[PDB]
Amino acid sequence: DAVVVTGYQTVERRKLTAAVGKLNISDETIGAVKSIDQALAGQIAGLSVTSTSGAPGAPAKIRIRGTSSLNGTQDPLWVLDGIPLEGTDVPQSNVLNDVSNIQQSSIAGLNPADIENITVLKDAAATAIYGARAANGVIVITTKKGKVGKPVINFSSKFTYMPTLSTNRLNMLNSQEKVDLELELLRSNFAYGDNKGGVSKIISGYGLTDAYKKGGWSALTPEAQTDISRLRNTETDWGDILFRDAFNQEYSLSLSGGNERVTYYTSIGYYQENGNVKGVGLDRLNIVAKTSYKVNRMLKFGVSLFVNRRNNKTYLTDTYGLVNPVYYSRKANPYYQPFDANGNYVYDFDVQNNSDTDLGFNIFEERKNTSNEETINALSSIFDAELRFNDKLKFTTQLGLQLDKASKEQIADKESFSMRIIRKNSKYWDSASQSNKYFIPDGGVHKAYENTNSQITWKAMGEYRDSFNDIHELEVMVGTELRKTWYETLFSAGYGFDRQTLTTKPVVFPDEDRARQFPLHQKTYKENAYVSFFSTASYSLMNRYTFGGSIRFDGSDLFGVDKKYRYLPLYSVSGLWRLSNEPFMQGTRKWMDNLAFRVSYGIQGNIDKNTSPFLLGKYIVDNILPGGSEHMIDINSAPNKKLRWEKTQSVNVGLDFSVLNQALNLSVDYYYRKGTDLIGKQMLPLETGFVSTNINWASMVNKGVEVSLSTRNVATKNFSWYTNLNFAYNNNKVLREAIPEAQTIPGREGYPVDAIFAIKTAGLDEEGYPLFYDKEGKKVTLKELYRLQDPFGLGFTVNSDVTPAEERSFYSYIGSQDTPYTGGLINTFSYKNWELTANLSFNLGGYVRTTPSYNFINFDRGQNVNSDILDRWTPENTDGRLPALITSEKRADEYYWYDQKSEIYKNLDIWVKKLNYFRLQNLRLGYRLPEKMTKSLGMGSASVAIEGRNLLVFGSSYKNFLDPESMYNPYAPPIPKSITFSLNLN
Amino acid sequence: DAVVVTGYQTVERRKLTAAVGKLNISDETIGAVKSIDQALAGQIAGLSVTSTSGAPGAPAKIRIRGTSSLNGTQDPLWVLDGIPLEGTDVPQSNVLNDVSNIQQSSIAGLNPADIENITVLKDAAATAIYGARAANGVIVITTKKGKVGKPVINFSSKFTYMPTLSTNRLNMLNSQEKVDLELELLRSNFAYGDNKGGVSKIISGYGLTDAYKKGGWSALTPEAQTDISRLRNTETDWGDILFRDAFNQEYSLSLSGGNERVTYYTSIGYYQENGNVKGVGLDRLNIVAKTSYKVNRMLKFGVSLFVNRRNNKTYLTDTYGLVNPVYYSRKANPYYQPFDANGNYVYDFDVQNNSDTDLGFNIFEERKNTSNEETINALSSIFDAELRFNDKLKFTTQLGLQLDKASKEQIADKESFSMRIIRKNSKYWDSASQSNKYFIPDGGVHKAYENTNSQITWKAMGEYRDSFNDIHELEVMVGTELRKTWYETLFSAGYGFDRQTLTTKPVVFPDEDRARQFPLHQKTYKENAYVSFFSTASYSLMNRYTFGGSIRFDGSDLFGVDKKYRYLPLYSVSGLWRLSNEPFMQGTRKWMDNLAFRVSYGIQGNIDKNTSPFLLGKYIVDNILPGGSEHMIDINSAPNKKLRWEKTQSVNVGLDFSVLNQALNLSVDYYYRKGTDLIGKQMLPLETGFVSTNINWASMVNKGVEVSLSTRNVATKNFSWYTNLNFAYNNNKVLREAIPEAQTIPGREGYPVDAIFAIKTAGLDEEGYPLFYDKEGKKVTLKELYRLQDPFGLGFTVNSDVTPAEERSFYSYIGSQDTPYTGGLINTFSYKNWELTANLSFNLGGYVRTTPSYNFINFDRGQNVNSDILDRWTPENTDGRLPALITSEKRADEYYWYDQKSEIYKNLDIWVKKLNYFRLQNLRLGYRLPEKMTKSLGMGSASVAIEGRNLLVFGSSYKNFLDPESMYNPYAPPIPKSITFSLNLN
Amino acid sequence: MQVFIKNRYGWTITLEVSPTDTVENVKQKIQDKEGFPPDKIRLIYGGKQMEDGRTLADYNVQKDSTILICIRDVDC
């Protein structure tokens, strides 16, 4: 439009000196999304949106101009109606199974049907007014408002069909080749687990496990052959047992309006979204109530209330995801039928990644006996008052209260695998009985989580706007902001739980460590306060030269009390020059509407909220003389009085260029943002009192180009065609970071945050082992590469003189997990009443380290495996490209070096694959009913639409995986395709 | 007031055949209260409001036309804009130390400034539309809404001063006479508490215990004499280090308005209130957002949203109130100073109601080491839709969502009396070492409570209103209602808790029995659903004869499945005859404008939510045969397929009489309500399989009269005087009830539900023992009354042949706890811009069993006493009227009969006091600023007011107590006095 | 729900018991509180010695009620 909302001011486009990306929100633009963090994929240049999981409610990882921190906050800041939101951060862990239980951001509570615009502030000139919350970018949510006039009511109803998850892309073995592989492994000497499997049990139950190894198929009795044939002929569809098609619903009723003194808006919205995995679902019901009154010609008071309630139902899994249905679709044996002839349960004892079959797993039994249900109650209230003291001087105050309360309840009955693992992990050595017992009572477990995230914000800013001599314009704002946040969590667990009786049983922990291993009651409390004083100035001359600036002094309890760093400015200096308005360039005005050059410089800031400036210690009992119990304190973390925000120096050079009556618009931005004082672990000098600690010392850099081109290809009375191309390249690079001396993989210094270092392989030798490269470029083995020595000759007694600093030279840099080139292409056609929008997105130039399809030392034959195990090296198939299943018979030294260092096989370059995928994010065809037909129905307007989401994904090949965004984490569902039919009435 | 709202429909006053009490909520009527339940005291006839406690947020016990149930619901039903409210039930118990930790009703979450009027439905004609929730009466809350016109902006600010609590009414002994009493007891041979008290400890510390007992004052060494004299001259103020004066502050901003199609209302309020006890406080933030849109000339859709957040902070006490500061001011020694010369803590070891000195208590240590906090987040959304199908036909639908989440956190540090008493209570007998140990660890305790109360209501009704021949008027409504309620509670306790470190310690319970008195994880879930179909009819003829009727079929999962009781109707019939409209009365219209006689009959019901219609059992592992271990179920609660609502058949006759143009309004109402099928424990025949069960058998009756007089005494251009007198007499009588055969207290049959039975005493005999009356009326002792026999002669081996049936004849009926005579008198004066409002409320006819000032056997002299112990009988003071402190040496059998039967002394008639009090509930003087000054300030209106709450209470004597309502429970603070200054701006 | 236990010398303690608790359980709670073998404890309420198999509700043990305790071979 003609104005930009930055969360503090409203800046005219002709006086905009900053990089700002706008996105108008409607059905014709973003589609039928249910969360607004998922509608930004490919719509704004420089804003890269990636999906962490495919389950409903899963937060999206968003990066604006790349990663701006190492160990601090990396997610953007979401501002709702001028009040920043809390709980929007995406929790990032190591365990791949944590995506099963990832918490939803508060952004999932805001209905996209109640939002008009999304404004993304990208550079220093736009973000520096946010102080120490600006290094990661800011996304400003402008919610819909009542329009002065007759009341307007909207009733949108969307019905979505989600197709079933097809595992044909998983490339898994059926019963035939699985049984053949098991038989060939039983013949061979590969005996890591030979009790596991289906063929192994059948053969060994008749005492033929030794006869088969010597004679083969003929050495088996027909009693043992008919069973194996039955195994071969038994086929089970695990994409039908585990996955489902879904019918999702969504309804929204929005009534608004206003008159010369009061503008009102009300909205209700309820949606039900199912997951592709059976038993997974998510409901959201929300209410929005806005009303703004004009008390006098000066005073104006408004109240906005957003109330939200979400309900999530999902499956219970272990800590390490042996149960996870998405991953269990890769482990379930093709010939294993969950039910027997009489309908009784049949248990899967091969579910553990260890060589122990005692805990059985049945998917139906777990679904019946387990539950993971969460309920989220959220509230956001904004009271904004404004006093127009003068035509030029205005004052504004704003109070924002946010409260999110999540109550989680995980129940696992006694007859379920999730309880079996708990009881097994409760194994302890009874000293008085010389045996092993279990201290967890016989019964179910009920775990309860209560998380509360509160925030109160108060802003007060005074704005002055004056114009002198009709060529000078001055805009000055001064304001302050107090913001306090609380995060309180409670966890409670009760063992021996009975689902109906609601009764638990006492637990007797042998030690305190075992009591910490099974916590029964945990409390967590975090509280922070922030005081900020900010100001902004802008001077426009002759409608041609705009000079802008901002400053912000931030203080918090998360910073040190040193007077040297206590209140240091976070500023920005900007500049705009409209070349099109120049008298010497007025000749080229019959075809050029705009040419503006804008530059910006400034310092942003980041807060690492997991670091404290206080002396965190622990109480111990000890003494310095015989007798007496002195209570001593051992320092856990060093007190850092110079703790402060992570500085980021940004330089942005922009260019706007519009021609032929908005026929062609171009916005180019080149940015260079160098980050310093990033909070990270440094190896301190020994005179500091500590070997190492977390201080402000690291460094970083991002730099690249954002290109946003919008075109009106066809402009005809009936047919119109528009194109919107957004492109962004980011060159991330870590400049100064520290790694442990014991670390053997190279550090990221000089490479992106998600750098992938892999051991380049030249193939296989004549015995199927991987072949490596030495410094001279010749093919060597592991024994030559690591210089393995075995003096004792026992095999498992190998050692190497290769230092970690030298082992870091074996790895080579492949790429980065985060794709440098991101963006999208949106094509809009309008033919009479028909409107077709095709939004496609691209993330090109990435790499992903995939889990090996099989382990060549630890291959578990009791679980299914990908179809590339058949392309491994075999004595009967010497043309295989993947490593053979090795044993300790041939080369004990190399085998045991591979065994005791599991990262060599995982870090081979053959498991790292390219990541270049284009995705058809949206394809929506809508029809607007003729005006006469709507008038006959009494509606101001009406419309229908058929929409396809995630229908097409192409680009680089993603073999053995269901999605290119699902190549890293096997425990997260893929992004589901959907077909939505929507009806809108007025 | 031409209409009456009943929560389902609007009834014209000229067609109102029911008993309805309406109170217009305003500053000039209710004053500056903060909860509606506290504003109804004396303002409605037949509605009795009693303060359960004086603490902030304490719910008020409300009774409409007496108590309508024995063991079921006894509180009225609150209706907010047609949607009934949940959580408005007062859970009272016999525990005197339970009101300190009392649940807050959801009514406390509604701002009285957002409420237009309160409608109380009293008889069957008004309540029978509520079905099985009508036996206790209904209170209908109508909230404010926007009036069509310019926005109305009302800002209110109230500043309240609460005077400090003065213990001068407690009449406690000071240091001098308490030390005198302790010395007197040490001289005597009083058996109880010889080790307690400062004098006894000082004297025994020097070893002069027997020396003192033999020689008096002169037998003590100078050091002991100086110590005791120091004790006498030491004075401690326990009313200023336990209580305080407070400055509370309330703010409210109500913005409203509307126009020809949309009407809007908004309000934000915030109050902070402090208790008279130090460290007790309660704040509330309330938001209201309502908007009603007129979609068409037929459809009309409205959304109301009430959001509430309350925060309560208070003290942690023992389960039986050994710490309570309100009771401690009644218990702390006058010469005990909690701080010594060095500022260290001095512990009071006499806080236990035992002979034990083990546990010490310091009030400052408890205050800084313990905390009891709570946060309540409440939400109430009401979506209503109306469709005007025809000029006579209308269809209304309504959906109400209510959600109340209360999170309580009780923390007790290691060095506090709460943790000390918990650890002491955790003492067990370890048989391995044959010694007494403690299983609760060393540290604090953190207890977390999370109670969620949710409700969904959906009503759908249709009204048809027609007029025939201009003299017949018919109104027929038919509708249905589906309601569902959930109540979930979670409790989690952690021992060994460190407040700073948030770390707990494991607990090893000796067995499962000791794990239930110290629970670590408890979960409760209760879900109920109700389906109701209702209808009303009304027929008005010649504008003088109105006939009304109401039917309601109610069903729930709390009722039995039996078909004969499945859906019985809850109905009502009613008739109104307006004599003033009769032609033969046409000559009396010059001085009378209303004479109406109304008659009503009906059947109401009540729901008991504790009883269940299901067989409730428990699991045991007993055996029938050797080696035949089995899992079998023991029945705990018998199934009752005939469970049903408690019937209450009611008749009512009322009279309305208005004369001299609303100069004199009189409303008389006589009612008789006989409730049968009440749920209670009946001693069943043994042929039913059970000795006793809770079934629908009991019965009671409430009969009485209500009078509402409203006069306009003076009507002048300047001066005006209005008077409003409400009176209500109620007679309660339990007609059928079962008492245990071993109970010695008389049953309540033929007496109110709360009868007080006391043993009448004739005074004291020559030895100070109380004297009793036998059947013949001659003064006898306890030996003659109980026919005590001592066969062994040991003194404590006393037995009596008096059967419990004979023992019940010793007691006599005194009165009832609730006063039969209730009401109030409100006088409103207006002179120029000045207004005054004097609201008085009387409760007459009650009795209360006060706790005895001292026990003649169990007198603890380590704690302070009333001044009436000096009125006891002693050898020197033979004229005392209170019983002497008796010993076992003089009459062993009587002493050891009074000992093991401690109810005889407590149930004497000398501890029962009358209850007849008039309380000045409100004295408000207002002043409306002149229009000229307000216009000069740019305001439509402005007003100030000075308000006095509970400034004066008189009536029957309440000696040794702080308030006539504090004569029963000594653990609850009295109703505080308040002086409020209110400023209102428009 | 608590009760008081008094000896013949006036020394009292407070025991938190349940109405559905057998007198043997009450004596075990007494042993837990103070060191006293349950087989050597006589409990008197209403003048009648309490049986080791009967519950407290049968004797009508109300709230805040006093029970005399006397140890065998000690004083009774």
mmCIF file with all atom_site columns, N, CA and C in Angstrom, chain B residues 589-602:
data_model
loop_
_atom_site.group_PDB
_atom_site.id
_atom_site.type_symbol
_atom_site.label_atom_id
_atom_site.label_alt_id
_atom_site.label_comp_id
_atom_site.label_asym_id
_atom_site.label_entity_id
_atom_site.label_seq_id
_atom_site.pdbx_PDB_ins_code
_atom_site.Cartn_x
_atom_site.Cartn_y
_atom_site.Cartn_z
_atom_site.occupancy
_atom_site.B_iso_or_equiv
_atom_site.pdbx_formal_charge
_atom_site.auth_seq_id
_atom_site.auth_comp_id
_atom_site.auth_asym_id
_atom_site.auth_atom_id
_atom_site.pdbx_PDB_model_num
ATOM 1  N N  . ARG B 1 589 ? -59.648 3.500   41.845 1.00 0.00 ? 589 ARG B N  1
ATOM 2  C CA . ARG B 1 589 ? -58.470 3.738   41.020 1.00 0.00 ? 589 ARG B CA 1
ATOM 3  C C  . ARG B 1 589 ? -57.844 5.106   41.253 1.00 0.00 ? 589 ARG B C  1
ATOM 4  N N  . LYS B 1 590 ? -58.490 5.978   42.028 1.00 0.00 ? 590 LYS B N  1
ATOM 5  C CA . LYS B 1 590 ? -57.912 7.285   42.316 1.00 0.00 ? 590 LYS B CA 1
ATOM 6  C C  . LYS B 1 590 ? -56.773 7.203   43.322 1.00 0.00 ? 590 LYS B C  1
ATOM 7  N N  . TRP B 1 591 ? -56.712 6.134   44.116 1.00 0.00 ? 591 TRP B N  1
ATOM 8  C CA . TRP B 1 591 ? -55.678 5.984   45.125 1.00 0.00 ? 591 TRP B CA 1
ATOM 9  C C  . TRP B 1 591 ? -54.978 4.634   45.090 1.00 0.00 ? 591 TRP B C  1
ATOM 10 N N  . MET B 1 592 ? -55.356 3.738   44.181 1.00 0.00 ? 592 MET B N  1
ATOM 11 C CA . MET B 1 592 ? -54.733 2.426   44.081 1.00 0.00 ? 592 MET B CA 1
ATOM 12 C C  . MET B 1 592 ? -54.462 2.116   42.618 1.00 0.00 ? 592 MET B C  1
ATOM 13 N N  . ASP B 1 593 ? -53.244 1.671   42.314 1.00 0.00 ? 593 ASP B N  1
ATOM 14 C CA . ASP B 1 593 ? -52.885 1.327   40.947 1.00 0.00 ? 593 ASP B CA 1
ATOM 15 C C  . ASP B 1 593 ? -52.508 -0.137  40.767 1.00 0.00 ? 593 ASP B C  1
ATOM 16 N N  . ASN B 1 594 ? -52.579 -0.951  41.816 1.00 0.00 ? 594 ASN B N  1
ATOM 17 C CA . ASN B 1 594 ? -52.278 -2.372  41.688 1.00 0.00 ? 594 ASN B CA 1
ATOM 18 C C  . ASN B 1 594 ? -52.828 -3.122  42.890 1.00 0.00 ? 594 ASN B C  1
ATOM 19 N N  . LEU B 1 595 ? -53.539 -4.213  42.620 1.00 0.00 ? 595 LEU B N  1
ATOM 20 C CA . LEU B 1 595 ? -53.927 -5.169  43.649 1.00 0.00 ? 595 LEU B CA 1
ATOM 21 C C  . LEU B 1 595 ? -53.952 -6.426  42.798 1.00 0.00 ? 595 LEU B C  1
ATOM 22 N N  . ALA B 1 596 ? -53.013 -7.336  43.046 1.00 0.00 ? 596 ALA B N  1
ATOM 23 C CA . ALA B 1 596 ? -52.982 -8.605  42.334 1.00 0.00 ? 596 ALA B CA 1
ATOM 24 C C  . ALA B 1 596 ? -52.765 -9.741  43.317 1.00 0.00 ? 596 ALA B C  1
ATOM 25 N N  . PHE B 1 597 ? -53.544 -10.806 43.160 1.00 0.00 ? 597 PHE B N  1
ATOM 26 C CA . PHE B 1 597 ? -53.399 -12.031 43.935 1.00 0.00 ? 597 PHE B CA 1
ATOM 27 C C  . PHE B 1 597 ? -52.859 -13.115 43.015 1.00 0.00 ? 597 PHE B C  1
ATOM 28 N N  . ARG B 1 598 ? -51.738 -13.718 43.395 1.00 0.00 ? 598 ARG B N  1
ATOM 29 C CA . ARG B 1 598 ? -51.129 -14.781 42.610 1.00 0.00 ? 598 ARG B CA 1
ATOM 30 C C  . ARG B 1 598 ? -51.051 -16.058 43.437 1.00 0.00 ? 598 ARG B C  1
ATOM 31 N N  . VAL B 1 599 ? -51.357 -17.181 42.798 1.00 0.00 ? 599 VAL B N  1
ATOM 32 C CA . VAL B 1 599 ? -51.261 -18.499 43.409 1.00 0.00 ? 599 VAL B CA 1
ATOM 33 C C  . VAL B 1 599 ? -50.383 -19.361 42.516 1.00 0.00 ? 599 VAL B C  1
ATOM 34 N N  . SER B 1 600 ? -49.562 -20.207 43.129 1.00 0.00 ? 600 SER B N  1
ATOM 35 C CA . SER B 1 600 ? -48.649 -21.047 42.372 1.00 0.00 ? 600 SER B CA 1
ATOM 36 C C  . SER B 1 600 ? -48.504 -22.397 43.054 1.00 0.00 ? 600 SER B C  1
ATOM 37 N N  . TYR B 1 601 ? -48.415 -23.444 42.240 1.00 0.00 ? 601 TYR B N  1
ATOM 38 C CA . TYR B 1 601 ? -48.105 -24.784 42.714 1.00 0.00 ? 601 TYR B CA 1
ATOM 39 C C  . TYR B 1 601 ? -47.101 -25.396 41.751 1.00 0.00 ? 601 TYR B C  1
ATOM 40 N N  . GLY B 1 602 ? -46.235 -26.262 42.261 1.00 0.00 ? 602 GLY B N  1
ATOM 41 C CA . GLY B 1 602 ? -45.254 -26.840 41.361 1.00 0.00 ? 602 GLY B CA 1
ATOM 42 C C  . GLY B 1 602 ? -44.434 -27.931 42.006 1.00 0.00 ? 602 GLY B C  1
#
